Amino acid sequence: STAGKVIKCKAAVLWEEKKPFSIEEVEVAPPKAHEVRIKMVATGICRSDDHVVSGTLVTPLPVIAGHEAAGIVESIGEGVTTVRPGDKVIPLFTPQCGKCRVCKHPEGNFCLKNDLSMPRGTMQDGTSRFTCRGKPIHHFLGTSTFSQYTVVDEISVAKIDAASPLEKVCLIGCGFSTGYGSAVKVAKVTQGSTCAVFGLGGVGLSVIMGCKAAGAARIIGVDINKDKFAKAKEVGATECVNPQDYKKPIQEVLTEMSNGGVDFSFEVIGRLDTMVTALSCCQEAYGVSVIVGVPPDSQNLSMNPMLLLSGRTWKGAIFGGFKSKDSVPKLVADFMAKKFALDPLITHVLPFEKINEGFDLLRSGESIRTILTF
Amino acid sequence: STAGKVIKCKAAVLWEEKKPFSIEEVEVAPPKAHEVRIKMVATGICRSDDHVVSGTLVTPLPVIAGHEAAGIVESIGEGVTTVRPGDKVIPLFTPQCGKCRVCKHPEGNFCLKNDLSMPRGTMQDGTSRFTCRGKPIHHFLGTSTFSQYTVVDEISVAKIDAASPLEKVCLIGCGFSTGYGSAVKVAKVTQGSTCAVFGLGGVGLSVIMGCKAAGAARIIGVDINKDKFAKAKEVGATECVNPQDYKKPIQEVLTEMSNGGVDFSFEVIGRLDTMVTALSCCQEAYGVSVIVGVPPDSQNLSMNPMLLLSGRTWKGAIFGGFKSKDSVPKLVADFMAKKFALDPLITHVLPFEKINEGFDLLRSGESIRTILTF
Ligand SMILES: NC(=O)c1ccc[n+]([C@@H]2O[C@H](COP(=O)([O-])OP(=O)(O)OC[C@H]3O[C@@H](n4cnc5c(N)ncnc54)[C@H](O)[C@@H]3O)[C@@H](O)[C@H]2O)c1
Ligand SMILES: NC(=O)c1ccc[n+]([C@@H]2O[C@H](COP(=O)([O-])OP(=O)(O)OC[C@H]3O[C@@H](n4cnc5c(N)ncnc54)[C@H](O)[C@@H]3O)[C@@H](O)[C@H]2O)c1
Ligand SMILES: OCc1cccc(F)c1F
Numbered sequence: 001s002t003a004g005k006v007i008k009c010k011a012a013v014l015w016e017e018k019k020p021f022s023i024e025e026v027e028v029a030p031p032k033a034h035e036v037r038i039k040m041v042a043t044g045i046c047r048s049d050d051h052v053v054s055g056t057l058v059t060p061l062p063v064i065a066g067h068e069a070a071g072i073v074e075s076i077g078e079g080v081t082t083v084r085p086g087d088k089v090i091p092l093f094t095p096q097c098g099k100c101r102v103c104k105h106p107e108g109n110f111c112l113k114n115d116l117s118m119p120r121g122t123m124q125d126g127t128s129r130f131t132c133r134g135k136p137i138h139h140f141l142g143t144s145t146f147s148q149y150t151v152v153d154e155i156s157v158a159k160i161d162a163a164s165p166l167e168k169v170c171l172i173g174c175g176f177s178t179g180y181g182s183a184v185k186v187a188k189v190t191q192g193s194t195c196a197v198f199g200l201g202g203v204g205l206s207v208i209m210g211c212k213a214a215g216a217a218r219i220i221g222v223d224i225n226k227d228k229f230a231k232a233k234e235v236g237a238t239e240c241v242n243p244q245d246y247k248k249p250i251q252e253v254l255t256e257m258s259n260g261g262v263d264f265s266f267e268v269i270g271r272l273d274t275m276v277t278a279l280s281c282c283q284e285a286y287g288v289s290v291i292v293g294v295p296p297d298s299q300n301l302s303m304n305p306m307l308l309l310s311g312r313t314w315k316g317a318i319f320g321g322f323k324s325k326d327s328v329p330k331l332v333a334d335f336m337a338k339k340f341a342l343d344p345l346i347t348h349v350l351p352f353e354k355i356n357e358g359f360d361l362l363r364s365g366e367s368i369r370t371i372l373t374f
Numbered sequence: 375s376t377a378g379k380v381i382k383c384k385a386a387v388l389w390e391e392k393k394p395f396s397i398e399e400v401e402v403a404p405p406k407a408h409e410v411r412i413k414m415v416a417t418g419i420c421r422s423d424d425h426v427v428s429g430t431l432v433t434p435l436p437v438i439a440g441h442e443a444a445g446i447v448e449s450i451g452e453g454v455t456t457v458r459p460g461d462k463v464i465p466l467f468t469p470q471c472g473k474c475r476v477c478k479h480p481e482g483n484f485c486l487k488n489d490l491s492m493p494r495g496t497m498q499d500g501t502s503r504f505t506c507r508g509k510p511i512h513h514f515l516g517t518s519t520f521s522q523y524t525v526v527d528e529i530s531v532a533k534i535d536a537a538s539p540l541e542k543v544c545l546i547g548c549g550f551s552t553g554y555g556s557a558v559k560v561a562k563v564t565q566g567s568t569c570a571v572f573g574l575g576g577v578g579l580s581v582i583m584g585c586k587a588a589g590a591a592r593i594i595g596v597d598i599n600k601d602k603f604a605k606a607k608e609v610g611a612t613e614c615v616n617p618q619d620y621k622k623p624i625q626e627v628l629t630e631m632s633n634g635g636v637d638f639s640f641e642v643i644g645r646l647d648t649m650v651t652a653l654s655c656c657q658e659a660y661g662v663s664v665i666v667g668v669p670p671d672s673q674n675l676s677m678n679p680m681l682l683l684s685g686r687t688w689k690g691a692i693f694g695g696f697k698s699k700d701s702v703p704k705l706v707a708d709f710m711a712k713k714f715a716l717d718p719l720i721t722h723v724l725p726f727e728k729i730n731e732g733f734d735l736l737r738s739g740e741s742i743r744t745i746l747t748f
């Protein structure tokens with residue numbers, strides 16, 4: 001009924017860095033060819049959304065942020081073949097065009113159509129579907145889920161199980177899949193190995209889930225906020241350490257705890273120094289370290305390449321290394337088959353209009369994932 | 375006839391940094407328990423030996439350097455089981471104790487008994503078997519092959535085929551195995567892939583051999599000395615580029631040539647800048663870059679961790695990833711079955727007494743490998 005028409009709805013607009021989100025009346029254009037308009041049902045608050053506010057992550061402003069979500073297709077543009085009105089969908093902040101060199105590669109998932117590398121904050125066609133008082137509002141990662149309605153390119157949406165609980169599976173759109181895949185797909189954590197996980201937020205907890213599912217014997221959680229430790233243990237951490245408790249550097253502590261270095265480490269915070277620390281604390285000859293955290297824009301780390309020459313492997317990934325359109329439906333199906341739990345990540349549930357409270361909670365350290373509902 | 379006696383012989387002693395080797399009389403003690411004294415037959419000049427002269431690689435002085443060699447066992451200490459007098463042998467600069475957590479790991483080769491990480495310049499028991507001018511002289515990487523006779527620990531020597539040509543197979547002691555393994559074992563180069571090799575000396579040429587053996591479709595050799603290009607092509611390079619011929623940085627050129635980045639890159643020089651460049655030129659989502667070159671002591675590089683977050687893999691290795699004592703005899707066996715060639719790496723042969731000339735040849739850019747014969 002609203003198909004082919006402009007929709008007037010509420011969205012959370014970020015006009016300036018370091019300000020609250022502003023709930024505004026926006027207009028959402030109808031989808032053009034190969035585009036999909038989605039009615040949002042739930043969206044998670046991910047630290048990466050906060051990075052937009054803080055200036056950690058640079059993207060064109062003003063902007064509708066939000067990238068971890070699930071909704072129902074309101075309508076489709078001409079030529080769309082992979083979803084239909086009424087379908088449950090998860091937007092993909094990393095697209096899967098299926099045609100680029102990366103999409104064709106067996107392991108690669110960072111599709112060249114992504115709006116992450118050099119953000120334009122638009123649809124694939126270089127334009128915006130959002131206006132606020134006649135002013136164009138930028139998109140974010142081709143998703144923009146902090147809105148009652150959004151429009152995405154077809155390559156940035158996956159159809160999921162019609163019976164799926166959107167208020168939970170929205171986490172598969174970023175936090176869970178990133179964390180879990182970083183362990184299971186990128187690191188390829190082995191049975192009986194020792195792992196160290198730096199950062200015990202939503203993503204780091206999902207890394208622990210992945211390490212536990214892979215059969216790691218030891219999973220050492222590292223966080224400067226000790227209130228994070230109880231949930232870390234609940235999901236599989238065998239021990240937790242707070243660097244603030246020690247008079248010495250935590251890589252030393254972890255090297256002694258692990259009798260010469262860990263098998264697998266993960267940086268799930270977004271700091272240069274913890275990226276170097278995580279690399280150092282893996283075993284010098286065969287250890288692997290995976291960067292998951294997003295560091296501050298344009299900042300370089302300093303490291304000694306002898307750390308690598310001895311035989312360490314250092315790698316990073318987006319979205320847990322999952323080819324997004326292929327994997328998101330299977331991860332939902334796996335959730336339905338009770339292969340993993342999502343409830344441990346959800347600490348708060350708030351209506352969408354309370355977005356700023358949701359971010360206050362994240363920033364204060366009290367929440368893991370707040371789910372915003374419509 | 376010399377068994378159990380102190381041997382008086384010639385060795386090239388390095389007394390101070392940035393000075394010629396001094397060929398003089400040294401005294402070589404008989405082997406103690408689990409030690410093996412070797413009459414040297416041939417030794418190659420590796421860039422790493424020159425790094426000791428230049429102070430790029432720090433090890434205690436005064437020293438008998440040299441680590442890429444082959445010889446014949448003169449005598450054994452009590453309890454030695456793996457070699458006998460008269461056996462042909464290759465000293466192992468990376469030991470294989472067989473007992474440490476690294477030796478027991480399926481992937482690791484950087485045995486914890488190595489003398490590379492925290493150089494002492496001794497035998498395993500922390501003493502030296504060399505005396506010169508009444509002074510004790512340090513060992514180098516438990517090998518010290520720039521001497522008519524040396525003493526090595528049993529874990530640092532492998533028995534090889536009795537009919538092998540030592541004036542060739544000495545290269546399996548470092549340069550060949552390092553380069554070859556970096557390609558075939560560490561990087562795990564795939565059939566049909568594109569490779570970029572930075573540095574076309576003995577080790578880089580060996581990397582090319584490995585890339586060709588792995589069935590790479592394209593192998594791009596990169597060197598600032600165009601005189602290296604012909605040999606590179608002979609051993610499998612499909613193209614060669616000199617950074618100095620281009621206005622854009624070579625990472626950009628290489629990215630263009632490969633339609634978005636190479637599958638595998640190798641730094642085989644030993645510069646911080648080329649380490650970062652080699653990382654950058656591999657495809658951002660699934661590229662792998664291997665550091666082989668030895669950088670100047672205690673210097674850190676600076677890099678943007680976004681190069682890894684997109685999905686790149688960065689690693690390095692000692693000795694091409696090979697478990698040294700297992701691998702060296704198999705590599706010799708393969709050489710005698712003509713599975714690879716060593717002749718292309720050998721540009722000069724000189725008697726040992728002309729060691730300084732051999733180093734001049736390396737420093738001038740004229741040679742790949744000079745073999746010294748005793
Ligand atoms: N690579 C990807 O695809 C991807 C996907 C999602 C999120 N991320 C990034 O992953 C990171 C984690 O996101 P999240 O949503 O879990 O965040 P979060 O803020 O919930 O978790 C970060 C945790 O790190 C801890 N921490 C902060 N400083 C620390 C320090 N010095 N030492 C130890 N712990 C410290 C905090 O106490 C917190 O628990 C962020 O940088 C985010 O942008 C990356
Ligand atoms: N990891 C290991 O186990 C291991 C083993 C052997 C050697 N190495 C190291 O590997 C490196 C190569 O050894 P080698 O014996 O082949 O040395 P080499 O000196 O013969 O070759 C190095 C090559 O790099 C080229 N080069 C110099 N600057 C360059 C620049 N900016 N760009 C491109 N090319 C440049 C030189 O012209 C030369 O051809 C050295 O650092 C050595 O110490 C490491
Ligand atoms: O949280 C996903 C994400 C969003 C923006 C930028 C990133 F690098 C990233 F990983």
Ligand SMILES: OCc1cccc(F)c1F
Nearest residue numbers: 420422431490548668692
């Ligand atoms: O050339 C072998 C070698 C010798 C000394 C130090 C090194 F890192 C190394 F790789």
Ligand SMILES: [Zn+2]
Nearest residue numbers: 046048174175
């Ligand atoms: Zn996210």
Ligand SMILES: [Zn+2]
Nearest residue numbers: 097100103111
């Ligand atoms: Zn693609």
Ligand SMILES: [Zn+2]
Nearest residue numbers: 420422548549
């Ligand atoms: Zn060498």
Ligand SMILES: [Zn+2]
Nearest residue numbers: 471474477485
């Ligand atoms: Zn060992």
